[PDB]
């Protein structure tokens, strides 16, 4: 029963991450889409830059 | 003793499943559900880059958007100019099986190792204008699959012994290593205020780790095989995945969840790589079909894909201004799509 | 009817000339709109297809030539610049032909040292010297046409070729027979044996039978002129001419379409473009 | 998160049989091959039984040829082994193991070193 | 005045591929192998006769080998044995002959000659310790192997004189139990190349050249249409 050595350190790490204050998925989901909205326009590959400002061409 | 402590590591991982159960009021399909969805996307590839001999291993954009490293199997570093596809730099390896390479968010630096277990850091900007070798990072015991830079005297590592490492490159000395997984790691990702860093490992699992305490915060799991991918969500709140069980999920730090899963009937091949664009509304991942497909992440619909490369499509990269995506793949090519 | 020439009308050439290009064309720029083809065996494909397009725009052009100062001095001027430019590069398409099979023999026989001997300098100064070779002869041996020498010095030269030609490939085809012997002998285990003999039969006789009648209508022309069978023999040399373009057709569709990454190319390059 | 759960085990006299059984959670059960290894009391870990996505192809040890079968359900997601005419050299650790990639037909899966798609296994005491 | 730097990038690009053409040159003449074995796999034997990964260079009749012999990797090898699916020939050794090994090697081999990578990569696969099989046998494989008890040497075996017909069968029973595998799953893509060595052996060297040689030679004849 050596590997008890091991087996305590799992249950150290398992409870050291029941022991988190999880938020709710749906603020989670609420903040990634409010993120997304905020910078939606600013992203290079889902606005249409003109192709007088892209650089690579 | 042993029956006992598995049974009490059984009861906190269901009372970890009842914790996360009672968080998962809503799924995040059921709120973008209202969202515009992003329309058809059609990259174009707008340069090619040749020189390199063998498949193409590993590449990482630079913080100015516009250089590259580049990594082979011929034993091979190349600098590359996306602007102009000049070449700057073409740096030979002590050995040829090299499986990772990084640029240092200055641009002094490159990194790379691979199935030697040493990790070398290459000086690119020195008084006599000729790349030599800064640093030799040694104590893995598996083989180096990613390297990331913190900043000029710090990287952090990872390899196939199932551990990570955080390194001060000044002394040359390992200075925190991460464990706790039981497979090989394959990818690191670091929080765009390089405090934190997720890795991905051989055991369809995922852990948060906090650089500066050397603990692991949180273990994510889900994937039905091993992960090959991982790259932190733009705002730094989430990340994505990929594995070899052809799905890609992405995850969230707050909830220590599976928030959505990027699937489809047509794909059984792995994700080789992952990435988010500036963003982060667009997921781009690398598959085993020799091409690239274009999520909406925040509705897992496909939005488009990046075909132009005739084997396995090992790497990706976007920049950090967004205007630009790299890949590489087996056939010695880095093609940019815009 | 032996005794008149035939006479095969000049649409079937022109429509010759201008398929041949749009074929040979269409390898060359297969082959150069893609890098992974510039391997020495690529090089001497690509050097077949430009003596195939030259051989087929020449011929093509001569016969319009002729046929628009018919219709209707320069003429002894500008066919003789033609019937030199055809010369020079039927001698460029046999040894294009020649140089292929030494290559793939150098690759079947020097399989270790191969990359060594055939360096892209290597092949750049052969193609090189092989096309001066064959313009400079050409030029001589239409210029003194009217000599024994140069057609005896013409049917020995293709006769070698042909003779290392078939060397070459049946050389290699006995190294795959042997290989096949020894693989068929496992335990756990058309058909390889059929494979080879069908890619010999195309590679050789297509050569033989485009090549081997006009040759044979130059060695008729030396030995036997007045003979009425040689004649007789001797009245379709535009035939002879037509079965020379034919062989320009079928020559990338048994070498050049025979690669994949080729065959890729050109159903791209067919379809933007 | 994968589980695998064996069951089925205990103490027989030579001669006697047992029926294992191995229970799977988190993944696709029909699209990835499914291994038997042993692990002997003295000796690492040995490769059983192996069979396909299907059940259409079945593999054994030379040794457990024709007193060992194995058998899938992908309704249930249960791997079994029938365990008969057993002798003293059977005595050891059985674990149930799925191969790493699914739709492949090559694994490898008999690691010393932790292997993570293995259950905890069940001792068959003979 | 900016020009003068796009012109000094070219003047860098003129002197970076010069250099790279002449490595192109060093790289596709050398001929790399990666060497596997068994645990009591005479992998070591197999280098003297001549960190994470160890190097060993040949010239054999002014031909480059480049031989890579996994050094201290974790047994996990599924993730990078991927990375040499372009050498020339993977070489496997394998003792014949305390744990069933030989199983243990047929399931690798089988694993190996399966991969999705490795469809395009020849095998050529030594069996080792030919003089402790033959002391075993003369002095037991049915234990381990039943269908041994009704196999019998082929008629175009062509043992060495004054072995004895037991170590014969043992011998082409553990080299057919490659070749099945080999065979089964081969689509004239990738062959094996099985041999029967002695832990003292020079001729191994000779072995891998031509080897080598038949494996190029065939690929170039199945792309000419000739096999
Ligand atoms: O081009 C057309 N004929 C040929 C094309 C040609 C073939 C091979 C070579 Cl190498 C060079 C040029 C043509 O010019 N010669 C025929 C060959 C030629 C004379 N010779 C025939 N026996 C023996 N010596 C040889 C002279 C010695 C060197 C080798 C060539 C040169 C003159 C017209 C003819 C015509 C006239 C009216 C209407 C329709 C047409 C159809 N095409
Ligand atoms: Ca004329």
Same mark, same amino acid.
């Given at each position: ?57 | ?27 995040? /399909? ?34 100015? /958007? ?29 050995? /040829? ?22 990790? /070398? ?218 | ?273 | ?126 | +005045? ?107 081999? +089988? ?44 008629? +175009? ?29 081969? +689509? ?40």
């Amino acid at each position: 029963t050596a590997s008890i050595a091991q087996a305590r350190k799992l249950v150290e790490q398992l409870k050291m991450e029941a022991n988190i204050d999880r938020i709710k998925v749906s603020k989670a989901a609420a903040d990634l889409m409010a993120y997304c909205e905020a910078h939606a326009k600013e992203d290079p590959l889902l606005t249409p830059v003109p192709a007088s400002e892209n650089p690579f061409r | 003793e042993l029956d006992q402590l598995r049974q009490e590591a059984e009861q906190l991982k269901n009372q970890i499943r009842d914790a996360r159960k009672a968080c998962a009021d809503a799924t995040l /399909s059921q709120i973008t559900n209202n969202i515009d969805p992003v329309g058809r996307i059609q990259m174009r590839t707008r340069r090619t880059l040749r020189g390199h001999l063998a498949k193409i291993y590993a590449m990482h954009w630079g913080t100015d /958007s516009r250089l590259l490293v580049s990594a082979s199997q011929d034993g091979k570093l190349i600098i590359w100019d996306s602007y102009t596809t000049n070449k700057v730099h073409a740096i030979p390896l002590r050995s /040829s099986w090299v499986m990772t390479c990084a640029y240092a968010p200055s641009g002094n630096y490159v990194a790379c190792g691979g199935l030697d277990n040493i990790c /070398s850091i290459y000086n690119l900007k020195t008084r006599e204008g000729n790349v030599r070798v800064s640093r030799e990072l040694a104590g893995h015991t598996g083989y180096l699959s990613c390297c990331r830079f913190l900043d000029d005297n710090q990287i952090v590592t990872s390899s196939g012994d199932t551990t990570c490492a955080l390194w001060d490159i000044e002394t040359g000395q390992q200075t925190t290593t991460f464990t706790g997984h039981t497979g090989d790691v394959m990818s690191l990702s670091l929080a765009p205020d390089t405090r934190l860093f997720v890795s991905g490992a051989c055991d369809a699992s995922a852990k948060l780790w906090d650089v500066r305490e050397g603990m692991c915060r949180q273990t994510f799991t889900g994937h039905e095989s091993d992960i090959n991918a991982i790259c932190f969500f733009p705002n730094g709140n989430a990340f994505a995945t990929g594995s070899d069980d052809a799905t890609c999920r992405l995850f969230d730090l707050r909830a220590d969840q599976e928030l959505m899963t990027y699937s489809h009937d047509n794909i059984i091949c792995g994700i080789t790589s992952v990435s988010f664009s500036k963003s982060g509304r667009l997921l781009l991942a690398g598959y085993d079909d020799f091409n690239c497909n274009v999520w909406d992440a925040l509705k897992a619909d496909r939005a488009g894909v990046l075909a132009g490369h005739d084997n396995r499509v090992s790497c990706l990269g976007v920049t950090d201004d967004g205007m630009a995506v790299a890949t590489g793949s087996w056939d010695s090519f880095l093609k940019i799509w815009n | 009817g032996c005794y008149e020439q035939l006479f095969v009308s000049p649409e079937v050439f022109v429509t010759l000339g201008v398929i041949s290009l749009l074929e040979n064309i269409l390898v060359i720029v297969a082959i150069a709109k893609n890098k992974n083809l510039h391997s020495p065996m690529y090089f001497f494909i690509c050097s077949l297809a430009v003596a195939d397009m030259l051989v087929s725009v020449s011929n093509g052009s001569e016969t319009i030539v002729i046929t628009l100062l018919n219709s209707t001095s320069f003429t002894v001027n500008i066919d003789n610049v033609i019937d030199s430019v055809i010369c020079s590069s039927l001698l460029a398409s046999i040894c294009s032909l020649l140089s292929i099979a030494v290559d793939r023999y150098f690759t079947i026989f020097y399989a270790l040292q191969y990359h060594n001997i055939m360096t892209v300098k290597r092949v750049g100064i052969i193609i090189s010297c092989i096309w001066a070779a064959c313009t400079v002869s050409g030029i001589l041996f239409i210029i003194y046409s009217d000599s024994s020498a140069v057609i005896i010095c013409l049917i020995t030269m293709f006769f070698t070729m042909l003779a290392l030609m078939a060397s070459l490939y049946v050389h290699m085809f006995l190294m795959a027979r042997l290989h096949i012997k020894r693989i068929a002998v496992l335990p756990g285990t058309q058909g390889a044996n059929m494979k080879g003999a069908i890619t010999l039969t195309i590679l050789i006789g297509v050569f033989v039978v485009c090549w081997a009648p006009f040759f044979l209508h130059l060695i008729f022309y030396i030995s036997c002129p007045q003979n009425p069978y040689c004649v007789c023999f001797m009245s379709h040399f535009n035939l002879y001419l037509i079965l020379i373009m034919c062989n320009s057709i079928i020559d990338p569709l048994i070498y050049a379409l025979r690669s994949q990454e080729l065959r890729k190319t050109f159903k791209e390059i067919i379809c933007c473009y | 998160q994968v589980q695998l759960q064996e069951s089925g085990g205990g103490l027989v006299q030579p001669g006697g049989s047992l029926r294992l059984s191995c229970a799977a959670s988190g993944f696709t059960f029909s699209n990835y091959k499914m291994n038997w290894v042993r692990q002997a009391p003295g000796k690492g870990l040995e490769w059983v039984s192996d069979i396909s996505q299907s059940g259409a192809s079945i593999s054994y040890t030379g040794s457990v040829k024709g007193r060992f079968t194995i058998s899938r359900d992908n309704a249930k997601n249960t791997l079994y082994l029938q365990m008969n005419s057993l002798k003293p050299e059977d005595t050891a650790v059985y674990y149930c193991a799925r191969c790493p990639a699914p739709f492949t037909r090559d694994c490898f899966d008999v690691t010393s070193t932790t292997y993570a798609y293995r259950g905890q296994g069940t001792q068959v005491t003979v | +005045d900016q020009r003068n730097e796009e012109k000094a990038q070219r003047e860098a690009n003129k002197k970076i591929e010069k250099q790279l053409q002449k490595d192109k040159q060093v790289y596709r003449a050398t001929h790399r192998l990666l060497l596997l074995g068994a645990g009591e796999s005479g992998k070591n034997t197999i280098v003297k006769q001549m960190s994470g990964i160890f190097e060993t260079k040949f010239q054999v009749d002014k031909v480059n080998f480049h031989m890579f012999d996994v050094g201290a990797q974790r047994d996990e090898r599924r993730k990078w044995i991927q990375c040499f699916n372009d050498v020339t020939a993977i070489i496997f050794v394998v003792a014949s002959s305390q744990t069933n090994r030989l199983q243990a090697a047929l399931k690798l081999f +089988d694993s190996i000659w399966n991969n999705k990578w490795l469809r395009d990569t020849s095998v050529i696969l030594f069996l080792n310790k030919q003089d402790l099989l033959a002391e075993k046998v003369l002095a037991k494989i049915e234990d381990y192997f039943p269908e041994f008890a009704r196999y019998t040497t082929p008629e +175009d075996a062509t043992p060495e004189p004054g072995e004895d017909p037991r170590v014969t069968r043992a011998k082409y029973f553990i080299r057919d139990e490659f070749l099945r595998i080999s065979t089964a799953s081969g +689509d004239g893509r990738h062959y094996c190349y099985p041999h029967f060595t002695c832990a003292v052996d020079t001729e191994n060297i000779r072995r891998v050249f031509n080897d080598c040689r038949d494996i190029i030679q065939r690929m170039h004849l199945r792309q000419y249409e000739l096999l």
